[PDB]
């Protein structure tokens, strides 16, 4: 077709170098962080990962912010539904809005 801008850049001594970590390794690190956060909580950031059920981890998170932990154990289905709806809204806003 016609000459590209990238070829004009490369023919005058300007080169783009590749990063050391590929996107597969960045996604692997992100997946490891997500798996540790989902299963263990904050225990994997201070040493060995210690398993806990996610409901009890979320009750710990509720006690952190000043709400008593029986609120989660009495509204667990509502809290899970609200989280799922918020994740779906993040999905829809990323599918529609491009700015």
């Amino acid at each position: 077709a016609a000459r590209d801008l990238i070829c004009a850049q490369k023919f005058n001594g300007l080169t783009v170098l590749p990063p050391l970590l590929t996107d597969e390794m960045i996604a692997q690190y992100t997946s490891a962080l997500l798996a540790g956060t989902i299963t263990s909580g904050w225990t994997f950031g201070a040493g060995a990962a210690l398993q806990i059920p996610f409901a009890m981890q979320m009750a710990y998170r509720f006690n952190g912010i000043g709400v008593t932990q029986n609120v989660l154990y009495e509204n667990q289905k509502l809290i899970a539904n609200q989280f799922n709806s918020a994740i779906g809204k993040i999905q829809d806003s990323l599918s529609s809005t491009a700015s």
Partner: protein, 105 residues
């Protein structure tokens, strides 16, 4: 301030800089236990004040989260909120009352 749970820090001077010695707390040796969110007793749900319910297979205890120090489950270290029909994963156990043996003596 370092990796782990932070306790202390000590400064030292260096050529064009500073060196921090961070003293932190790391958990070391772990064990598996069976855990529950609440305890059903007398038609009531008991939740721990601070700590977590654990079981070694036979008996149920309450302990602090960052160190294994099991204790007898008592109304002093638990609070009551509602009945057992709304909590998912509630178990059946007895809750000790210190007033009852003092009343009989």
């Amino acid at each position: 301030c370092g990796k782990g749970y932070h306790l202390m820090s000590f400064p030292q001077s260096a050529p064009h800089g500073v060196v921090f010695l961070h003293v932190t707390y790391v958990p070391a040796q772990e064990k598996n236990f069976t855990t529950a969110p609440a305890i059903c007793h007398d038609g009531k749900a008991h939740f721990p004040r601070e700590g977590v319910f654990v079981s070694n297979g036979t008996h149920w205890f309450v302990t602090q989260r960052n160190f294994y120090e099991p204790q007898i489950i008592t109304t002093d270290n638990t609070f009551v909120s509602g009945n057992c029909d709304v909590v998912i994963g509630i178990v059946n156990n007895t809750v000790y009352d210190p007033l009852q043996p003092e009343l009989d003596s």
